[PDB]
Write a protein that holds these residues in place. Structure first.
Motif, PDB file in Angstrom:
ATOM      1  N   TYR A  73      41.763  40.453  45.074  1.00 18.74           N
ATOM      2  CA  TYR A  73      40.465  40.767  45.285  1.00 18.74           C
ATOM      3  C   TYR A  73      39.690  41.289  44.037  1.00 18.74           C
ATOM      4  N   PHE A  74      40.432  42.527  43.463  1.00 19.19           N
ATOM      5  CA  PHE A  74      39.717  43.309  42.520  1.00 19.19           C
ATOM      6  C   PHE A  74      39.883  42.806  41.154  1.00 19.19           C
ATOM      7  N   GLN A  75      41.115  42.006  40.814  1.00 16.75           N
ATOM      8  CA  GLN A  75      41.306  41.401  39.582  1.00 16.75           C
ATOM      9  C   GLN A  75      40.536  39.958  39.503  1.00 16.75           C
ATOM     10  N   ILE A  76      40.435  39.265  40.589  1.00 18.95           N
ATOM     11  CA  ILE A  76      39.272  38.118  40.559  1.00 18.95           C
ATOM     12  C   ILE A  76      37.955  38.557  40.126  1.00 18.95           C
ATOM     13  N   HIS A  77      37.573  39.746  40.628  1.00 24.18           N
ATOM     14  CA  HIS A  77      36.107  40.256  40.495  1.00 24.18           C
ATOM     15  C   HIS A  77      36.240  40.752  38.650  1.00 24.18           C
ATOM     16  N   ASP A  78      37.114  41.547  38.381  1.00 22.41           N
ATOM     17  CA  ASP A  78      37.368  41.705  37.037  1.00 22.41           C
ATOM     18  C   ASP A  78      37.420  40.637  35.894  1.00 22.41           C
ATOM     19  N   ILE A 122      51.117  36.416  38.898  1.00 30.68           N
ATOM     20  CA  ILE A 122      50.858  37.538  38.047  1.00 30.68           C
ATOM     21  C   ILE A 122      49.943  38.700  38.387  1.00 30.68           C
ATOM     22  N   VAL A 123      48.933  38.568  38.950  1.00 32.95           N
ATOM     23  CA  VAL A 123      47.940  39.503  39.409  1.00 32.95           C
ATOM     24  C   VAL A 123      48.492  40.523  40.545  1.00 32.95           C
ATOM     25  N   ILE A 124      49.302  40.167  41.521  1.00 33.95           N
ATOM     26  CA  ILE A 124      49.960  41.119  42.475  1.00 33.95           C
ATOM     27  C   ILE A 124      50.877  42.150  41.726  1.00 33.95           C
ATOM     28  N   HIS A 125      51.798  41.580  40.864  1.00 32.47           N
ATOM     29  CA  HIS A 125      52.601  42.258  40.101  1.00 32.47           C
ATOM     30  C   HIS A 125      51.797  43.014  39.082  1.00 32.47           C
ATOM     31  N   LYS A 126      50.905  42.728  38.388  1.00 33.05           N
ATOM     32  CA  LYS A 126      50.129  43.207  37.079  1.00 33.05           C
ATOM     33  C   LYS A 126      49.142  44.420  37.630  1.00 33.05           C
ATOM     34  N   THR A 127      48.725  44.117  38.852  1.00 26.88           N
ATOM     35  CA  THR A 127      47.450  45.422  39.424  1.00 26.88           C
ATOM     36  C   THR A 127      47.576  45.885  40.581  1.00 26.88           C
ATOM     37  N   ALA A 128      47.994  44.961  41.641  1.00 21.55           N
ATOM     38  CA  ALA A 128      47.978  45.341  43.121  1.00 21.55           C
ATOM     39  C   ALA A 128      49.087  46.666  43.274  1.00 21.55           C
ATOM     40  N   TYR A 129      50.303  46.591  42.846  1.00 19.00           N
ATOM     41  CA  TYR A 129      51.169  47.606  42.863  1.00 19.00           C
ATOM     42  C   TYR A 129      51.062  49.041  42.363  1.00 19.00           C
ATOM     43  N   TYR A 130      50.421  49.168  41.179  1.00 17.84           N
ATOM     44  CA  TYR A 130      50.147  50.358  40.611  1.00 17.84           C
ATOM     45  C   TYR A 130      48.677  50.926  41.040  1.00 17.84           C
ATOM     46  N   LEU A 151      36.994  49.704  50.056  1.00 11.12           N
ATOM     47  CA  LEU A 151      36.618  48.195  49.725  1.00 11.12           C
ATOM     48  C   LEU A 151      35.229  47.963  49.627  1.00 11.12           C
ATOM     49  N   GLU A 152      34.219  48.732  50.090  1.00 12.08           N
ATOM     50  CA  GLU A 152      32.808  48.786  50.009  1.00 12.08           C
ATOM     51  C   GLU A 152      32.376  49.443  48.633  1.00 12.08           C
ATOM     52  N   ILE A 153      32.876  50.802  48.670  1.00 13.35           N
ATOM     53  CA  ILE A 153      32.430  51.537  47.371  1.00 13.35           C
ATOM     54  C   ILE A 153      33.106  51.031  45.872  1.00 13.35           C
ATOM     55  N   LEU A 154      34.112  50.548  45.977  1.00 14.44           N
ATOM     56  CA  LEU A 154      34.904  49.980  44.854  1.00 14.44           C
ATOM     57  C   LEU A 154      34.231  48.629  44.384  1.00 14.44           C
ATOM     58  N   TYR A 208      35.932  37.605  36.915  1.00 10.80           N
ATOM     59  CA  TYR A 208      34.356  37.355  36.810  1.00 10.80           C
ATOM     60  C   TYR A 208      33.715  38.070  35.924  1.00 10.80           C
ATOM     61  N   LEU A 209      33.823  39.422  35.826  1.00 10.35           N
ATOM     62  CA  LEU A 209      33.060  40.359  35.162  1.00 10.35           C
ATOM     63  C   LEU A 209      33.018  39.976  33.685  1.00 10.35           C
ATOM     64  N   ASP A 210      34.366  39.506  33.410  1.00 15.04           N
ATOM     65  CA  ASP A 210      34.765  39.247  32.099  1.00 15.04           C
ATOM     66  C   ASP A 210      33.855  37.996  31.300  1.00 15.04           C
ATOM     67  N   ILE A 211      33.302  37.286  32.106  1.00 14.92           N
ATOM     68  CA  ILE A 211      32.464  36.042  31.716  1.00 14.92           C
ATOM     69  C   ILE A 211      30.991  36.379  32.322  1.00 14.92           C
ATOM     70  N   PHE A 212      30.858  37.106  33.195  1.00 15.65           N
ATOM     71  CA  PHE A 212      29.673  37.435  33.891  1.00 15.65           C
ATOM     72  C   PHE A 212      28.774  36.005  34.572  1.00 15.65           C
TER      73      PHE A 212
END
Lengths: 345, 348
Positions: B246-251, B203-211, B345-348, B253-257
């Motif tokens: 990596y970034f969608q898992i962070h997103d 899901i995540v690779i197709h939903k976020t990684a490509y664009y 990777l560090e800045i984002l 995580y942020l949704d719950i905090f």
């Protein structure tokens, strides 16, 4: 034509195979294939395919015989415009809150689909077109010109749909008042007398219908058959598409009434009524037009001014105008196809 | 900052295209007002991480850049920000959102509504190709750039479809879609058979990684002269998949905090991690409380996320995934790109 209807499965499967190439688990691949096979079948089939047939016939009567390879490229473009028509119908039914399309439930109403899937499905159907043109025409010299024809005709259609949706809206009536981004309150719709004219109507009708229903299929057939972009005949075809698009929409306005009135739409009968009717009849129109109730029907009763008779007089004048333009194309093949299309429609 | 200054040039170039249409002057005035707002309301206010990634990838592959070359780079960078704007407008209609970038979702505005918003997604999407045509039609990379946008968009749509229907009854048992039901709504329920990391990654690779990652990097790389057939693109694709996950898992995580993933019945990393380590009775609790538009139901899921130390598991995941991304970056064999990707990777 027979080949065009038969080749449907090939184009739908060539696109579904591209989705099947994705890095997904086998069970997930099966799920998307079953959903997307139905998205294409339910919305691309059951139609008259006049746009598709127009590509085939134009290509056939321009070509100077045709093999299976060239016919595969022509039928691809013909089915791409049918996919474009399906993407627009799915989007239009969400937008105008439609109930029936091709004598069955609107895609977005299905509980396995709903608005959430149908919006995503419009973009899918739209993008499938460019993937299909890449599969079958990426090595043709006309490739970039063909994809630009689809892109420019779609942009004009979107603008035509915007105008059709917002011509009677508050942002258009109260021109000096800037759009309020803080207001989130179904705004009560009213008719606007300043927009009830034939000039505004032509602007909408040409952009909403003429470019994707007439210009795009004819240009597709002409580009593939080898007619150079700079040739004089393309502008002549653009003007003919405008005339045919106007002729086709005024007929569709005539077939919807005598949800047009209910959706507060600018129609040819509404414009013609205002052109002949006096001030007390104008007040009555403003009071009733744009309501979901069957009593507000007064508008249908006023349509009194012999609008059905006025249409027959318009249809005669418009057909002669289209024939006048066709006769100056100086291309017997395209002329036969366009005269044939004008009768069988 | 230099990229944000370029915005007006691309918005106006497309507005000028619409203005050349055969329409009455008063009609031209109304559409220019509506569409200037469509672009301004939805393309500005963002972090512009996707746009800046084009600029930096282009800058470091090129190794100075003249104004005409940077006009082409900034066009592609703004086109990805326009694509982001189109996807966010559509997602808000789909998930029935209320707020986006601290303001009301575009479809909720009185002068817009669902009808205009649906049409506006198609306009924003097609504006990208008109802008690429205006600034890159004569470039050798032109056809490849537009195929990259089309293919990353097609993968995003499939990802968004899976995100929307992974738990739906039509997929719960592989059966046929019901073309006759338009009245009895589907009761939102979790499908434990889909609650696994393998399905989530799909899901995540197709939903976020490509664009969000592959598309910006490939834009900078194609415009700089790295031909589409180069073997380094598969390496960029693999890294983009790792960064996207990596970034969608962070997103997640942020949704719950706030955050509506639980109430919206979404397949999230916290849900999969909780399901992996929780007790059989707690799996019953999840099935009963997940994806329900009730506070007491969401609060049971929230307490499980605190009980099963999802914060600690994310921190442990982040360290392992960061090391995995850096390792893939190091095997790229291109100093300029490696530097950008390590920096981003560090800045984002």
């Amino acid at each position: 034509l027979a080949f065009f209807r038969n080749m449907y499965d090939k184009y739908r499967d060539a696109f579904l195979s591209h989705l099947n190439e994705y890095s997904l688990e086998e069970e997930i691949k099966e799920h998307i294939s079953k959903y997307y096979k139905l998205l294409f079948d339910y919305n691309c089939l059951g139609g008259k395919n006049n746009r598709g047939i127009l590509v085939i016939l134009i290509y056939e009567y321009v070509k100077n015989d045709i093999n299976s390879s060239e016919w595969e490229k022509a039928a691809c473009l013909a089915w791409c415009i049918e996919i474009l028509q399906a993407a627009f119908l799915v989007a239009d039914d969400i937008m105008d809150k439609g109930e029936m399309r091709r004598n069955k439930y609107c895609w977005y109403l299905l509980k396995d689909v709903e608005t959430k899937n149908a919006v995503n499905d419009v973009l899918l159907l739209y993008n499938s077109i460019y993937k299909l043109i890449e599969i079958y025409l990426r090595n043709e010299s006309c490739y970039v010109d063909v994809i630009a024809t689809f892109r420019d005709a779609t942009l004009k259609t979107i603008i035509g749909q915007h105008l059709d949706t917002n011509i009677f809206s508050d942002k258009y009536s109260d021109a000096h008042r800037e759009i309020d981004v803080n207001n989130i309150n179904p705004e009560q719709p009213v008719i606007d007398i300043n927009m009830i004219n034939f000039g505004v109507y032509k602007n909408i009708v040409i952009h909403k219908t003429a470019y994707y229903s007439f210009f795009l299929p004819i240009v597709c057939g002409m580009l593939l058959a080898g007619i150079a972009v700079d040739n004089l005949i393309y502008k002549k075809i653009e003007d003919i598409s405008m005339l045919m698009g106007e002729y086709f929409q005024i007929h569709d306005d005539y077939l919807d009434i005598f949800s047009d009135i209910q959706n507060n739409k600018l129609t040819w009968p509404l414009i013609k009524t205002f052109e002949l009717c006096s001030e007390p009849d104008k007040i009555k129109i403003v009071k009733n037009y744009g309501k979901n109730n069957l009593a507000c029907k007064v508008i249908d009763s006023l349509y009194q001014y012999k609008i059905r008779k006025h249409y027959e007089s318009y249809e005669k004048a418009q057909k002669a105008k289209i024939l006048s333009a066709i006769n100056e194309l100086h291309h017997e093949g395209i002329e036969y196809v366009l005269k044939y299309l004008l009768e069988i429609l």
